[PDB]
Amino acid sequence: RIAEVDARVVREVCSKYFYDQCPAVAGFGPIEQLPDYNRIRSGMFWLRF
């Protein structure tokens, strides 16, 4: 299964689960600078792509 993996497989598999998906965020401690959820959500896609 590992040998089957090449660069294309990683681009396809990662886009399936990461790209333009809503993440779950958990913060604890001095988290004033933790980005807003919308900004985090916007970090899950690229306008250039």
Partner 1 sequence: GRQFGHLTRVRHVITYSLSPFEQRAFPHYFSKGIPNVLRRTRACILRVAPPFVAFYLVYTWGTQEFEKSKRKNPA
Ligand X SMILES: CCCCCCCCCCCCCCCCCC(=O)OC[C@H](COP(=O)([O-])OCC(O)COP(=O)([O-])OC[C@@H](COC(=O)CCCCCCCCCCCCCCCCC)OC(=O)CCCCCCCCCCCCCCCCC)OC(=O)CCCCCCCCCCCCCCCCC
38 binds ligand X (CB under 6 A): no
Site for partner 1 in 1-49 (CB under 8 A): 22, 30, 32-33, 37-38, 41
Which tokens hold the place of 24? 């779950």
Site for ligand 6PE in 25-44 (CB under 6 A): 42-43
Provide, rounded to whole angstroms, the least separation between the CB of residue 41 and partner 1.
7
The sign of the CA dihedral 30, 36, 37, 41 is negative
**Helix, strand and coil in the chain, % to nearest 5:** 35, 0, 65
The nearer residue to ligand 6PE, 9 or 40, going by C-beta atoms, is 40
